[PDB]
Symmetry: C4
Subunit: 31 residues, 4 copies
């Protein structure tokens, strides 16, 4: 495991955050 599945869920959530950051950076670069 439950503890491994829970860390995976947290890692995935960081990934969504990073994807959002990249959306913004792209727009700041006019891409």
């Amino acid at each position: 495991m439950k503890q491994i599945e829970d860390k995976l869920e947290e890692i995935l959530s960081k990934l969504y955050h990073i994807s959002n950051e990249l959306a913004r950076i792209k727009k700041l670069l006019g891409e």
Copy 2:
């Protein structure tokens, strides 16, 4: 677990996507 497997796959796959976004940004800045 199957869920753990799905999540590893999903994490790996989102990481491919992020790696490619970054590669496109690097390509665009290179030009």
Copy 3:
């Protein structure tokens, strides 16, 4: 597992670092 635990921690931690690098880049482009 202990190794699996170490690796989840290491992945999570590198993800914090990457998220912050991206945040600094976004901050720098904002200015």
Copy 4:
């Protein structure tokens, strides 16, 4: 698990790749 530890190793390796990409992007941005 062995198969989970092996996917974690692969995920970590993508992370190192992304860190390299970010090194280059930073230099392209003069940061």
